[PDB]
Structure formats: structure tokens, C-alpha cells
Amino acid sequence: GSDLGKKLLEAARAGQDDEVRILMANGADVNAFDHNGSTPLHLAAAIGHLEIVEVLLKYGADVNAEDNWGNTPLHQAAWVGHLEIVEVLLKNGADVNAQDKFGKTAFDISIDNGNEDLAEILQKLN
Amino acid sequence: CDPLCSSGGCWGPGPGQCLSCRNYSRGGVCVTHCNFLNGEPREFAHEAECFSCHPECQPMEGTATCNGSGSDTCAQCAHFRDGPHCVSSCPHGVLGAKGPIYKYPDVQNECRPCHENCTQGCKGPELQDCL
Secondary structure, X not given: OHHHHHHHHHXXXXXXXXXXXXXXXXXXXXXXXXXXXXXXXXXXHHHOOHHHHHHXXXXXXXXXXXXXXXXXXXXXXXXXOOHHHHHHHHHOXXXXXXXXXXXXXXXXXXXXXXXXXXXXXXXXXX | OOOOEOOOOEOOOOOOOEOOEOOEEEOOEEEOXXXXXXOOOOXXXXXXXXXXXXXXXXXXXXXXXXXXXOOOOEXXXXXXXEXXXXXXXXXXXXXXXXXXEEEEEOOOOEXXXXXXXXXXXXXXXXXXXXX
């Protein structure tokens, strides 16, 4: 599952949806991480692949996993403006008030970037 | 005893049932050699044990594919390279120390920085290359 976890990180990184599904079916470590602390869920959240996010969550991905800087996948999704991914992470138990290395939540990030829709979603969902 | 067990002896006739190996071992099973030059996955050795090369190392023919398990010890990257690491794809806004990192692959499949003001990625280094 360790060799498959390395392959899983690369498939999630490149947005290879089918590859991720095949790798999870073979038992790849869903909580594996690369040299940046980024797990497959962090990588999927950055590229905007909603189906990969859901596949990893179905196979037991830690929705509150932190990278080398203390960032959760919710922080990654908010930083790049992926609203539907933010909504799916919130539905699967993401801590809405998780703070990054500057004490900021997904809400503070959305406000700092002027994303009014993201801030509104975060307010209404929590 | 299996012929791959050392002079010492074994606890069963199988390759994975020796007390010590004559040459190499893959997951406790004695082997004649690691997948250095041929076979899958490609491997390197450490203390007479076979370990897999990172899946992003380009499998080399007639020469070693890697000298360690990290994506930074490949003889060549199968797809793209970001700094010292062989990666399947250049960053697509993955968080780094100061926020999202966006890069584009050059002619030599090396990940180069996007311009400071690109928010959806880039296809080159200039501001007009954003997206």
C-alpha cells in the first residue's frame, strides 16, 4: 500500500480520476503525503477535481490532515476558490475554524482574496 | 533448504524461509538479484535488501533507474521535474510557504514559475501567458 500511496499522490496531483479510483480499489494509502506534507486530498483540492476529492473521502481520507505549513484541505480549496470542493469537505467533517500558520481560517482567506461567494457559503454552512 | 540461503541454514525449504540470504532479499524473501537493470518495479539496494524506485523515475535500460526511494534520486524523470523532484504534473496552485504555487512545464519538461499575478495557472513566464 506504500508503493501505491506514492502512485496515488501522483495520480491525484495530475487529476487522473480513473487512475485514483483503480489505485484506491487496490488499497493505496489514502493518507500518504509528499515532500510538502500534501496528501492526495490536498492535491485533488488544488487541481479542482471534485470526483477525486469524493473518492478519497469515500475510502477514509482524513478531511483535517495538515501539510508542512499547518494547512488543511479546506485551506487549500478556499485559497484557490473551489466552492463545491469546500462544500464537500465541510459535509464530510472539515473543521471550518481550522487556522493556518497565520491564525487564519478558510473564511479569513476568502475575505483576504475578495471571494464574496466563498465567504457567503462558509457563513451559511457554518 | 533453498539454494539461495547462506551457509548458516534455514527454517524451511522456501526462498522466504532462510535465516539469512546468500546475495539479496526482497521483503525478507531471498533473490538472486534486485531489479537493478531489468524488471518491474525498478529497484536499488541498501544493506543487501531490494527497495523500489519512486514511480516517477523513468525506468532506464542497461543502467540504474535510481539510487534511493525518493523522487529526487532518479537517473531521469518519466514525466516532469519540479526542482529536485520527479512529478507527474507541475504545481496547480498547491500551497507552499507563502500560498498557492502555479508553474508551467518548459520544452525540457522542467517546471518553471508562473508570473506573480497569475491566479488560474499559466502556459509560460509572462503576464500574457496567464491561463
